[PDB]
Design a protein around this ligand. Structure first.
Ligand SMILES: Nc1nc2c(ncn2[C@@H]2O[C@H](COP(=O)(O)OP(=O)(O)O)[C@@H](OP(=O)(O)O)[C@H]2O)c(=O)[nH]1
Ligand SMILES: [Mg+2]
Length: 178
């Protein structure tokens, strides 16, 4: 027998960073019958084919309005093979607070004996000329913790598909060459 290959990715970060915009931007290609199959659930599914004709379904979880201490947060983070730490490049506190989001991820990782792929996602790159987190500051946070680095715009779609695709590939031990 052979079963579906599914990877769970959770999207974390402070309110107003663009988490729901980001997840929706990636979900849009599935709108119609497939997205409707999980309407009102905690996640949606999107199938991608990674290089080498590797079919995988991504199960993408938006935490909604959950805060760091939310007692529902566990179902989002436990089992997550990929984690997006999302901030708004124009909102400094959203970046600073990612240390605290990452503390929860480390705690879950240690308990679960897992090593999820963690991506730092600077959203709103369409607003680059008004950013309050410089690229160098973002890349320092990535270097300190081994995060995958992404600058995206959920509004316009810039780099969004590639962020999820790269995270999926890295979960499976593949560095995509582009
Ligand atoms: N310029 C820009 N704005 C973005 C981007 N991503 C999200 N936004 C805006 O940021 C606001 C918060 O987005 P949302 O997806 O609800 O964030 P959240 O789910 O993290 O709370 C929304 O504004 P509104 O209240 O206007 O809808 C949304 O339109 C982006 O890449 N660029
Ligand atoms: Mg939201």
């Amino acid at each position: 027998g052979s079963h579906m290959r599914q990877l769970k990715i959770v999207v974390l970060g402070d309110g107003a960073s663009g988490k729901t915009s980001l997840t929706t931007c990636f979900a849009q290609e599935t709108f119609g019958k497939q997205y409707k199959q999980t309407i009102g659930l905690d996640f949606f599914l999107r199938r991608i084919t990674l290089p080498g004709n590797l079919n995988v379904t991504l199960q993408i979880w938006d935490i909604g309005g959950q805060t760091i201490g939310g007692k529902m947060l566990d179902k989002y983070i436990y089992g997550a093979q990929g984690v997006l730490l999302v901030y708004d490049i124009t909102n400094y506190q959203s970046f600073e607070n990612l240390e605290d989001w990452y503390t929860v991820v480390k705690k879950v990782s240690e308990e679960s004996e897992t090593q999820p792929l963690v991506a730092l996602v600077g959203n709103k790159i369409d607003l680059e000329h008004m950013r309050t987190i410089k690229p160098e500051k973002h890349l320092r946070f990535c270097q300190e913790n081994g995060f995958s680095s992404h600058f995206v715009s959920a509004k316009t779609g810039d780099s969004v598909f590639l962020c999820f695709q790269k995270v999926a590939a890295e979960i499976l031990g593949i560095k995509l060459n582009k």
